């Protein structure tokens, strides 16, 4: 299948991403606490529901939450300021909280049922969000021997997600909080996000030599994000 592209709301970021975040791919955004990772997730959960000529995929959303940071009223606000019905947009987001990393892994399996269910409706699932991808794994797998073990569990989790993305033509979007490195990653595309002067947000592609050089810059607004 041809890949689809979901607009972020930012023309700058869209150009950096070559039109938007891709289906049949896992896109990881990573950065420090407060850089706007969860805002980008909220914005995409609306943008994907737009028709294709407005940058969306007429799609449904599934959302796995590990830090209780999902905000339905924020979805409503973004939808409202982009011309969409707030409650209809919320209704097309299926939401689960992952209790721990093991539950998080099972939920990917659980998600496939709804993905199958909607596949030939007018609004198939087109976006699967995992926020945070790594927080449970960080907290549970720690100390001597944990590096190998945690990386193995995470790779397995990511493989499950890659399968859904490829099998059902879905964009997977995941967040990862970073502080201080050198660890392997298996996301299709990695985007480094940081908060800059005057509240602007700046995004850069990491280890993507064949993709645009440069940084995109946007603001967090009532429309989600915009240039």
């Amino acid at each position: 299948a041809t890949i689809g592209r979901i607009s972020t709301g930012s023309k700058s970021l869209d150009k950096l991403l070559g039109g938007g975040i891709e289906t049949q791919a896992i896109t990881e955004v990573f950065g420090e606490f407060g850089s706007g990772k969860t805002q980008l997730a909220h914005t995409l959960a609306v943008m994907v529901q737009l028709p294709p000529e407005e940058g969306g995929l007429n799609g449904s959303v599934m959302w796995i939450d590990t830090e209780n940071t999902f905000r339905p009223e924020r979805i409503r606000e973004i939808a409202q300021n982009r011309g969409l019905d707030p409650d209809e947009v919320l209704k097309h987001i299926a939401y689960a909280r992952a209790f721990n990393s093991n539950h998080q892994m099972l939920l990917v399996q659980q998600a496939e049922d709804m993905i199958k269910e909607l596949l030939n409706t007018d609004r198939p699932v087109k976006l699967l969000i995992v926020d945070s991808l790594t927080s449970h794994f960080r907290s549970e797998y720690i100390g001597r021997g944990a590096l190998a073990e945690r990386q193995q569990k995470l790779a397995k989790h990511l493989a499950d997600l890659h399968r859904l993305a490829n099998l059902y033509d879905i964009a997977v979007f995941v967040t990862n909080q970073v502080q201080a490195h050198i660890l392997a990653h298996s996301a299709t595309l990695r985007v480094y996000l940081r908060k800059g002067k005057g509240g602007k947000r700046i995004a850069r592609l990491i280890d993507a030599p064949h993709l645009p050089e440069g940084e995109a810059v946007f603001s967090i607004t009532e429309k989600g994000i915009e240039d």
């Binding site: 339905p72 209704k91 299926a94 939401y95 939920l107 659980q110 998600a111 709804m114």
Partner: peptide
């Protein structure tokens, strides 16, 4: 998973 739950709606909304």
């Amino acid at each position: 998973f739950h709606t909304g």
